[PDB]
Amino acid sequence: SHCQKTSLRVNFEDIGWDSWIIAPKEYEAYECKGGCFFPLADDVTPTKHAIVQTLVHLKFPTKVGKACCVPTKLSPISVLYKDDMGVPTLKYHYEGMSVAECGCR
Amino acid sequence: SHCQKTSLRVNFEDIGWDSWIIAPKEYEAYECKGGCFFPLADDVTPTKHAIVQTLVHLKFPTKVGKACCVPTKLSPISVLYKDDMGVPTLKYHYEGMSVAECGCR
Ligand SMILES: [Cl-]
Ligand SMILES: [Cl-]
Ligand SMILES: [Cl-]
Ligand SMILES: [Cl-]
Ligand SMILES: [Cl-]
Ligand SMILES: [Cl-]
Ligand SMILES: [Cl-]
Ligand SMILES: [Cl-]
Ligand SMILES: [Cl-]
Ligand SMILES: [Cl-]
Ligand code: NA
Ligand code: NA
Ligand code: NA
Ligand code: NA
Ligand code: NA
Ligand code: NA
Ligand code: NA
Ligand code: NA
């Protein structure tokens, strides 16, 4: 109904990253989906500008766009990548790959 | 062309806040407009998940949405508000009201 985290399995070969990512083949990135219209939920954690823009968009829908459900906190994953030498190397904390929290911004 | 900060003057009476905000009558909130498609600019400061989602959306446009140009840093303003007593009170740093930086998230 509103801004929330939903599932999103990403295949690295489909996005053209299999050339430098050996493993894993796929991973769970999640995504943020849902509207930011009023009334909001108790755990949306919206900013005051997101609230203002939503109100302005309600009054002028053709001139001002809506606020967006977006990742507000990200989590790392581990990836096995080949470096310039070409040897499998483990990046233990490859930051910013998975959604931890969603929100209206 | 891409994700950037553009002007947005917000009238407090139009958004139904004039009941508790005496001054100012309007203020400059800015907004974030633009696409997040490739190729990106040098100052978009995108997250890796925003990059992954943009790639996945390119491959599956009907199943995965695009990343969004959103405020990544906010600035405060000062407002003159009437409190429960009804006396004009100055909120010097009313946080989160103006866009400082935009970005793809
Ligand atoms: Cl609400
Ligand atoms: Cl805020
Ligand atoms: Cl690491
Ligand atoms: Cl650790
Ligand atoms: Cl990293
Ligand atoms: Cl690029
Ligand atoms: Cl990141
Ligand atoms: Cl203050
Ligand atoms: Cl100060
Ligand atoms: Cl505040
Ligand atoms: Na995929
Ligand atoms: Na897939
Ligand atoms: Na309009
Ligand atoms: Na650990
Ligand atoms: Na306005
Ligand atoms: Na106006
Ligand atoms: Na598709
Ligand atoms: Na000051």
Coordinates of all heavy atoms in Angstrom, one line a residue, chain B residues 20-98:
Chain B
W20 N -0.7 27.5 11.9 CA 0.4 27.5 12.9 C 1.7 28.2 12.5 O 2.5 28.3 13.4 CB 0.7 26.0 13.3 CG 1.6 25.3 12.4 CD1 1.3 24.7 11.2 CD2 3.0 25.0 12.6 NE1 2.4 24.1 10.6 CE2 3.4 24.3 11.5 CE3 3.9 25.4 13.6 CZ2 4.8 23.9 11.3 CZ3 5.2 25.0 13.4 CH2 5.6 24.2 12.3
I21 N 1.8 28.6 11.3 CA 3.0 29.3 10.8 C 2.6 30.7 10.5 O 1.9 31.0 9.5 CB 3.7 28.6 9.6 CG1 4.3 27.3 10.0 CG2 4.7 29.5 9.0 CD1 5.0 26.6 8.9
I22 N 3.1 31.7 11.3 CA 2.7 33.1 11.1 C 3.6 33.7 10.0 O 3.2 34.4 9.1 CB 2.8 33.9 12.4 CG1 2.1 33.2 13.5 CG2 2.3 35.3 12.2 CD1 2.2 33.8 14.9
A23 N 4.9 33.4 10.1 CA 5.9 34.0 9.1 C 7.0 33.0 8.9 O 7.4 32.3 9.9 CB 6.4 35.3 9.6
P24 N 7.6 33.0 7.7 CA 7.3 33.7 6.5 C 6.1 33.2 5.8 O 5.6 32.2 6.1 CB 8.6 33.6 5.7 CG 9.1 32.2 6.0 CD 8.8 32.0 7.5
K25 N 5.6 34.0 4.9 CA 4.4 33.6 4.1 C 4.8 32.5 3.1 O 4.0 31.5 2.9 CB 3.7 34.7 3.4 CG 3.2 35.8 4.4 CD 2.6 37.0 3.7 CE 1.4 36.6 2.9 NZ 0.8 37.8 2.2
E26 N 5.9 32.7 2.4 CA 6.4 31.7 1.5 C 7.9 31.4 1.8 O 8.5 32.2 2.5 CB 6.3 32.1 0.0 CG 4.8 32.4 -0.4 CD 4.7 32.7 -1.9 OE1 5.7 32.5 -2.6 OE2 3.6 33.2 -2.3
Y27 N 8.4 30.4 1.2 CA 9.9 30.1 1.4 C 10.3 29.2 0.2 O 9.5 28.7 -0.5 CB 10.2 29.4 2.7 CG 10.1 27.9 2.7 CD1 11.3 27.2 2.8 CD2 8.9 27.3 2.7 CE1 11.2 25.8 2.8 CE2 8.8 25.9 2.7 CZ 10.0 25.2 2.8 OH 9.9 23.8 2.8
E28 N 11.6 29.2 0.0 CA 12.3 28.5 -1.1 C 12.7 27.1 -0.6 O 13.7 26.9 0.1 CB 13.5 29.3 -1.6 CG 14.2 28.6 -2.7 CD 13.4 28.5 -4.0 OE1 12.6 29.4 -4.3 OE2 13.6 27.4 -4.7
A29 N 11.9 26.1 -1.0 CA 12.2 24.7 -0.6 C 13.1 23.9 -1.5 O 13.7 23.0 -1.1 CB 10.9 23.9 -0.4
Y30 N 13.1 24.4 -2.8 CA 13.8 23.7 -3.9 C 13.2 22.3 -4.1 O 12.4 21.8 -3.3 CB 15.3 23.5 -3.7 CG 16.0 24.8 -3.5 CD1 16.2 25.3 -2.2 CD2 16.4 25.6 -4.5 CE1 16.9 26.5 -2.0 CE2 17.1 26.8 -4.3 CZ 17.3 27.3 -3.0 OH 17.9 28.5 -2.8
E31 N 13.5 21.6 -5.2 CA 13.1 20.2 -5.4 C 14.2 19.6 -6.3 O 15.0 20.2 -6.9 CB 11.8 20.2 -6.1 CG 11.7 20.9 -7.5 CD 10.4 20.7 -8.2 OE1 9.5 20.0 -7.7 OE2 10.2 21.3 -9.3
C32 N 14.1 18.3 -6.3 CA 15.1 17.5 -7.1 C 14.4 16.9 -8.3 O 13.4 16.1 -8.1 CB 15.7 16.4 -6.2 SG 16.7 17.0 -4.8
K33 N 14.8 17.2 -9.5 CA 14.2 16.8 -10.8 C 15.3 16.3 -11.7 O 16.5 16.7 -11.6 CB 13.5 17.9 -11.5 CG 12.1 18.3 -10.9 CD 11.6 19.6 -11.4 CE 11.6 19.7 -12.9 NZ 10.7 18.7 -13.5
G34 N 14.9 15.3 -12.5 CA 15.8 14.8 -13.5 C 15.8 13.2 -13.5 O 15.4 12.6 -12.5
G35 N 16.3 12.6 -14.6 CA 16.4 11.2 -14.6 C 17.7 10.7 -14.0 O 18.6 11.4 -13.6
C36 N 17.7 9.4 -13.8 CA 18.9 8.7 -13.2 C 19.4 7.6 -14.2 O 20.0 6.6 -13.7 CB 18.5 8.0 -11.9 SG 18.2 9.3 -10.6
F37 N 19.2 7.8 -15.5 CA 19.6 6.8 -16.5 C 21.1 7.0 -16.8 O 21.7 8.0 -16.5 CB 18.8 6.9 -17.7 CG 18.6 8.4 -18.2 CD1 19.6 8.9 -19.1 CD2 17.6 9.2 -17.8 CE1 19.5 10.2 -19.6 CE2 17.4 10.5 -18.3 CZ 18.4 11.0 -19.2
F38 N 21.7 6.0 -17.4 CA 23.0 6.0 -17.9 C 23.2 6.7 -19.2 O 22.3 6.6 -20.0 CB 23.6 4.6 -17.9 CG 23.8 4.0 -16.6 CD1 22.9 3.0 -16.2 CD2 24.9 4.3 -15.8 CE1 23.1 2.4 -15.0 CE2 25.0 3.7 -14.6 CZ 24.1 2.7 -14.2
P39 N 24.3 7.4 -19.4 CA 25.4 7.6 -18.5 C 25.2 8.7 -17.5 O 24.4 9.7 -17.7 CB 26.5 8.1 -19.5 CG 25.8 8.8 -20.6 CD 24.5 8.0 -20.8
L40 N 25.7 8.6 -16.3 CA 25.5 9.5 -15.2 C 26.5 10.6 -15.2 O 27.6 10.6 -15.9 CB 25.6 8.8 -13.9 CG 24.6 7.7 -13.6 CD1 24.9 6.9 -12.3 CD2 23.1 8.2 -13.6
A41 N 26.3 11.7 -14.5 CA 27.2 12.8 -14.4 C 28.2 12.5 -13.2 O 28.1 11.6 -12.5 CB 26.4 14.1 -14.1
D42 N 29.2 13.4 -13.2 CA 30.3 13.3 -12.2 C 29.9 13.7 -10.8 O 30.7 13.4 -9.9 CB 31.5 14.0 -12.7 CG 32.1 13.6 -14.0 OD1 31.5 12.6 -14.6 OD2 33.1 14.1 -14.5
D43 N 28.8 14.4 -10.6 CA 28.4 14.8 -9.3 C 27.1 14.3 -8.8 O 26.4 14.9 -7.9 CB 28.4 16.4 -9.2 CG 27.5 17.0 -10.3 OD1 27.4 16.4 -11.4 OD2 26.9 18.0 -10.0
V44 N 26.6 13.2 -9.4 CA 25.3 12.6 -9.0 C 25.5 12.0 -7.7 O 24.5 11.9 -6.9 CB 24.8 11.7 -10.1 CG1 23.4 11.1 -9.7 CG2 24.7 12.3 -11.4
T45 N 26.7 11.5 -7.3 CA 26.9 10.7 -6.1 C 25.9 9.6 -5.9 O 25.2 9.6 -4.9 CB 26.9 11.6 -4.9 OG1 25.6 12.1 -4.6 CG2 27.9 12.8 -5.1
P46 N 25.9 8.6 -6.8 CA 24.9 7.5 -6.7 C 25.3 6.4 -5.9 O 26.5 6.1 -5.8 CB 24.7 7.1 -8.2 CG 26.0 7.3 -8.8 CD 26.7 8.5 -8.1
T47 N 24.4 5.7 -5.2 CA 24.7 4.5 -4.5 C 24.8 3.3 -5.4 O 24.3 3.4 -6.6 CB 23.6 4.3 -3.4 OG1 22.3 4.1 -4.1 CG2 23.5 5.4 -2.5
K48 N 25.4 2.3 -5.0 CA 25.6 1.1 -5.8 C 24.2 0.4 -6.0 O 24.0 -0.1 -7.1 CB 26.5 0.1 -5.1 CG 27.9 0.7 -4.8 CD 28.9 -0.3 -4.5 CE 30.2 0.3 -4.0 NZ 30.8 1.3 -4.9
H49 N 23.3 0.5 -5.0 CA 22.0 -0.1 -5.3 C 21.2 0.7 -6.3 O 20.5 0.2 -7.1 CB 21.2 -0.1 -3.9 CG 19.8 -0.8 -4.1 ND1 18.7 -0.1 -4.5 CD2 19.4 -2.0 -3.9 CE1 17.7 -0.9 -4.5 NE2 18.1 -2.1 -4.2
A50 N 21.3 2.1 -6.3 CA 20.7 2.9 -7.3 C 21.3 2.5 -8.7 O 20.5 2.5 -9.7 CB 20.9 4.4 -7.0
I51 N 22.6 2.3 -8.8 CA 23.2 1.8 -10.0 C 22.6 0.5 -10.5 O 22.3 0.2 -11.6 CB 24.7 1.9 -9.9 CG1 25.2 3.3 -9.9 CG2 25.3 1.0 -11.0 CD1 26.6 3.5 -9.3
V52 N 22.6 -0.5 -9.5 CA 22.1 -1.8 -9.8 C 20.6 -1.8 -10.3 O 20.2 -2.4 -11.3 CB 22.2 -2.7 -8.6 CG1 21.4 -4.0 -8.8 CG2 23.7 -3.1 -8.4
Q53 N 19.8 -1.0 -9.5 CA 18.4 -0.9 -9.9 C 18.2 -0.3 -11.3 O 17.3 -0.7 -12.1 CB 17.6 -0.1 -8.8 CG 16.1 -0.1 -9.1 CD 15.3 0.4 -7.9 OE1 15.8 0.3 -6.8 NE2 14.1 1.0 -8.2
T54 N 19.0 0.7 -11.6 CA 18.9 1.3 -12.9 C 19.2 0.3 -14.0 O 18.6 0.3 -15.1 CB 19.8 2.5 -13.0 OG1 19.5 3.5 -12.0 CG2 19.7 3.2 -14.4
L55 N 20.3 -0.5 -13.8 CA 20.6 -1.6 -14.7 C 19.5 -2.6 -14.8 O 19.1 -3.0 -16.0 CB 21.9 -2.2 -14.4 CG 23.2 -1.4 -14.4 CD1 24.4 -2.1 -13.8 CD2 23.5 -1.1 -15.9
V56 N 18.9 -3.0 -13.7 CA 17.9 -4.0 -13.7 C 16.6 -3.4 -14.4 O 15.9 -4.1 -15.2 CB 17.5 -4.5 -12.3 CG1 16.4 -5.5 -12.3 CG2 18.8 -5.2 -11.7
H57 N 16.3 -2.2 -14.2 CA 15.2 -1.5 -14.8 C 15.4 -1.5 -16.3 O 14.4 -1.6 -17.1 CB 14.9 -0.1 -14.3 CG 14.0 0.7 -15.1 ND1 12.6 0.5 -15.0 CD2 14.2 1.6 -16.0 CE1 12.0 1.4 -15.9 NE2 13.0 2.0 -16.5
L58 N 16.6 -1.2 -16.8 CA 16.9 -1.2 -18.2 C 16.6 -2.5 -18.8 O 16.0 -2.6 -19.9 CB 18.3 -0.8 -18.4 CG 18.7 -0.5 -19.9 CD1 17.8 0.6 -20.5 CD2 20.2 -0.2 -20.0
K59 N 16.9 -3.6 -18.1 CA 16.7 -5.0 -18.7 C 15.2 -5.4 -18.5 O 14.7 -6.2 -19.3 CB 17.6 -6.0 -18.0 CG 17.8 -7.3 -18.7 CD 18.4 -7.1 -20.1 CE 18.6 -8.4 -20.8 NZ 19.6 -9.3 -20.1
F60 N 14.5 -4.9 -17.5 CA 13.2 -5.3 -17.2 C 12.4 -4.1 -16.8 O 12.0 -3.9 -15.7 CB 13.1 -6.3 -16.0 CG 13.9 -7.6 -16.3 CD1 15.2 -7.7 -15.7 CD2 13.4 -8.6 -17.0 CE1 16.0 -8.8 -15.9 CE2 14.2 -9.8 -17.2 CZ 15.5 -9.8 -16.7
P61 N 12.1 -3.2 -17.8 CA 11.4 -2.0 -17.5 C 10.0 -2.1 -17.0 O 9.5 -1.2 -16.2 CB 11.4 -1.2 -18.9 CG 11.5 -2.3 -19.9 CD 12.3 -3.4 -19.3
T62 N 9.3 -3.2 -17.3 CA 7.9 -3.4 -16.8 C 7.9 -4.0 -15.4 O 6.8 -4.0 -14.8 CB 7.2 -4.3 -17.8 OG1 7.8 -5.6 -17.9 CG2 7.1 -3.6 -19.2
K63 N 9.0 -4.6 -15.0 CA 9.0 -5.3 -13.7 C 9.7 -4.6 -12.6 O 9.4 -4.8 -11.4 CB 9.5 -6.7 -13.9 CG 8.9 -7.6 -14.9 CD 9.5 -8.9 -15.1 CE 9.4 -9.8 -13.9 NZ 10.0 -11.1 -14.1
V64 N 10.7 -3.7 -12.9 CA 11.5 -3.0 -11.9 C 11.5 -1.6 -12.3 O 11.8 -1.2 -13.4 CB 12.9 -3.6 -11.8 CG1 13.7 -2.8 -10.8 CG2 12.9 -5.0 -11.4
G65 N 11.2 -0.7 -11.3 CA 11.1 0.7 -11.6 C 12.5 1.4 -11.6 O 13.5 0.8 -11.2
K66 N 12.5 2.6 -12.0 CA 13.8 3.3 -12.1 C 14.2 3.8 -10.7 O 13.4 3.8 -9.8 CB 13.7 4.6 -13.0 CG 12.8 4.4 -14.2 CD 12.3 5.7 -14.7 CE 12.8 6.1 -16.1 NZ 11.7 6.0 -17.1
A67 N 15.5 4.3 -10.6 CA 15.9 4.9 -9.3 C 15.4 6.3 -9.3 O 15.0 6.8 -10.4 CB 17.4 4.9 -9.3
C68 N 15.4 7.0 -8.2 CA 14.7 8.3 -8.1 C 15.6 9.5 -7.7 O 16.5 9.2 -6.9 CB 13.5 8.3 -7.1 SG 12.2 7.1 -7.5
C69 N 15.5 10.6 -8.4 CA 16.2 11.8 -8.0 C 15.6 12.4 -6.7 O 14.4 12.8 -6.8 CB 16.1 12.9 -9.1 SG 17.1 14.4 -8.8
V70 N 16.3 12.4 -5.6 CA 15.7 12.8 -4.3 C 16.7 13.6 -3.5 O 17.9 13.6 -3.8 CB 15.3 11.5 -3.5 CG1 14.0 10.9 -4.1 CG2 16.4 10.5 -3.5
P71 N 16.2 14.4 -2.6 CA 17.0 15.1 -1.7 C 17.9 14.2 -0.9 O 17.4 13.4 -0.2 CB 16.1 15.9 -0.8 CG 14.8 16.0 -1.7 CD 14.8 14.7 -2.4
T72 N 19.2 14.4 -0.9 CA 20.1 13.6 -0.1 C 20.7 14.4 1.1 O 21.3 13.8 2.0 CB 21.3 13.0 -1.0 OG1 22.1 14.1 -1.5 CG2 20.8 12.2 -2.1
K73 N 20.5 15.7 1.1 CA 20.9 16.5 2.3 C 19.9 17.6 2.3 O 19.5 18.2 1.3 CB 22.3 17.0 2.1 CG 22.8 17.8 3.3 CD 24.2 18.2 3.2 CE 24.7 19.0 4.4 NZ 23.9 20.3 4.6
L74 N 19.4 17.9 3.6 CA 18.4 19.0 3.8 C 19.0 20.1 4.7 O 19.9 19.8 5.5 CB 17.2 18.4 4.4 CG 16.4 17.4 3.6 CD1 15.3 16.8 4.4 CD2 15.9 18.0 2.3
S75 N 18.4 21.3 4.5 CA 18.8 22.5 5.3 C 17.6 23.0 6.0 O 16.5 22.9 5.6 CB 19.3 23.6 4.3 OG 20.6 23.1 3.7
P76 N 17.8 23.6 7.2 CA 16.7 24.2 8.0 C 16.4 25.6 7.5 O 17.1 26.2 6.8 CB 17.3 24.2 9.4 CG 18.8 24.5 9.2 CD 19.1 23.7 7.9
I77 N 15.2 26.0 8.0 CA 14.8 27.4 7.9 C 14.3 27.9 9.3 O 14.2 27.1 10.2 CB 13.7 27.7 6.8 CG1 12.4 27.0 7.3 CG2 14.1 27.2 5.5 CD1 11.1 27.4 6.5
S78 N 14.0 29.2 9.4 CA 13.5 29.7 10.6 C 12.0 30.1 10.3 O 11.6 30.6 9.2 CB 14.2 31.0 11.0 OG 15.6 30.7 11.3
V79 N 11.1 29.8 11.3 CA 9.7 30.0 11.2 C 9.2 30.6 12.5 O 9.7 30.4 13.6 CB 8.9 28.7 10.9 CG1 9.2 28.2 9.5 CG2 9.3 27.6 11.9
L80 N 8.2 31.5 12.3 CA 7.6 32.1 13.4 C 6.2 31.4 13.6 O 5.3 31.6 12.8 CB 7.4 33.6 13.2 CG 6.7 34.4 14.3 CD1 7.5 34.3 15.6 CD2 6.5 35.9 14.0
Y81 N 6.1 30.6 14.7 CA 4.9 29.8 14.9 C 4.3 30.2 16.3 O 5.0 30.6 17.2 CB 5.3 28.3 15.0 CG 6.0 27.9 16.2 CD1 5.2 27.3 17.3 CD2 7.3 28.1 16.4 CE1 5.8 26.8 18.4 CE2 7.9 27.6 17.6 CZ 7.2 27.0 18.6 OH 7.8 26.6 19.7
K82 N 3.0 30.1 16.3 CA 2.2 30.3 17.6 C 2.1 29.0 18.3 O 1.7 27.9 17.8 CB 0.8 30.8 17.3 CG 0.0 30.0 16.3 CD -1.4 30.5 16.1 CE -1.4 31.9 15.5 NZ -0.9 31.9 14.1
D83 N 2.5 29.0 19.6 CA 2.5 27.8 20.4 C 1.1 27.6 21.1 O 0.2 28.4 20.8 CB 3.6 27.9 21.5 CG 3.4 29.1 22.4 OD1 2.8 30.1 21.9 OD2 3.7 29.1 23.6
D84 N 1.0 26.7 22.0 CA -0.3 26.4 22.6 C -0.8 27.6 23.3 O -2.0 27.8 23.4 CB -0.2 25.2 23.6 CG 0.3 23.9 22.9 OD1 0.0 23.7 21.7 OD2 1.0 23.1 23.6
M85 N 0.1 28.5 23.8 CA -0.4 29.8 24.4 C -0.9 30.7 23.3 O -1.8 31.5 23.6 CB 0.8 30.4 25.1 CG 0.4 31.7 25.8 SD -0.8 31.5 27.1 CE -0.9 33.2 27.7
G86 N -0.4 30.6 22.1 CA -0.8 31.4 21.0 C 0.1 32.6 20.7 O -0.3 33.5 20.0
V87 N 1.2 32.7 21.3 CA 2.2 33.8 21.2 C 3.2 33.4 20.1 O 3.7 32.3 20.1 CB 2.9 34.1 22.6 CG1 3.9 35.2 22.4 CG2 1.8 34.4 23.6
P88 N 3.5 34.4 19.2 CA 4.5 34.1 18.2 C 5.8 33.7 18.8 O 6.4 34.3 19.7 CB 4.7 35.5 17.5 CG 3.4 36.2 17.8 CD 2.6 35.5 18.8
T89 N 6.3 32.5 18.4 CA 7.6 31.9 18.9 C 8.4 31.6 17.7 O 8.0 31.1 16.7 CB 7.3 30.7 19.7 OG1 6.4 31.0 20.8 CG2 8.6 30.2 20.3
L90 N 9.7 31.9 17.8 CA 10.7 31.7 16.7 C 11.3 30.3 16.8 O 12.0 30.0 17.8 CB 11.7 32.8 16.7 CG 12.8 32.6 15.6 CD1 12.2 32.7 14.2 CD2 13.9 33.7 15.8
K91 N 11.2 29.5 15.8 CA 11.9 28.3 15.7 C 13.1 28.5 14.8 O 12.9 28.6 13.5 CB 11.0 27.2 15.1 CG 11.7 25.8 14.9 CD 12.3 25.3 16.2 CE 13.0 24.0 16.0 NZ 13.6 23.5 17.2
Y92 N 14.2 28.8 15.4 CA 15.4 29.3 14.6 C 15.9 28.3 13.6 O 16.1 28.6 12.4 CB 16.5 29.6 15.6 CG 17.7 30.4 14.9 CD1 17.5 31.6 14.3 CD2 18.9 29.8 14.9 CE1 18.5 32.3 13.7 CE2 20.0 30.5 14.3 CZ 19.8 31.7 13.7 OH 20.8 32.4 13.1
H93 N 16.0 27.0 13.9 CA 16.4 25.9 13.1 C 15.3 24.9 13.0 O 15.3 23.9 13.7 CB 17.8 25.3 13.6 CG 19.0 26.2 13.3 ND1 19.0 27.1 12.3 CD2 20.1 26.3 14.0 CE1 20.2 27.7 12.3 NE2 20.9 27.3 13.4
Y94 N 14.4 25.1 12.1 CA 13.3 24.1 11.8 C 13.9 23.2 10.7 O 13.9 23.5 9.5 CB 12.0 24.8 11.3 CG 10.8 24.0 11.3 CD1 10.4 23.4 12.5 CD2 10.1 23.7 10.2 CE1 9.3 22.6 12.6 CE2 8.9 22.9 10.2 CZ 8.6 22.4 11.4 OH 7.4 21.6 11.4
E95 N 14.3 22.0 11.1 CA 15.2 21.2 10.3 C 14.4 20.5 9.1 O 13.2 20.3 9.2 CB 15.9 20.1 11.1 CG 16.8 20.7 12.2 CD 18.0 21.4 11.7 OE1 18.4 21.1 10.6 OE2 18.6 22.2 12.5
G96 N 15.2 20.2 8.1 CA 14.7 19.4 7.0 C 13.7 20.1 6.0 O 12.9 19.4 5.4
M97 N 13.8 21.4 5.9 CA 12.8 22.1 5.1 C 13.3 22.4 3.7 O 12.5 22.6 2.8 CB 12.4 23.4 5.8 CG 11.6 23.2 7.0 SD 9.9 22.5 6.7 CE 9.2 23.9 5.9
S98 N 14.6 22.6 3.4 CA 15.1 23.0 2.2 C 16.1 22.0 1.6 O 16.9 21.4 2.4 CB 15.8 24.4 2.3 OG 14.9 25.4 2.6

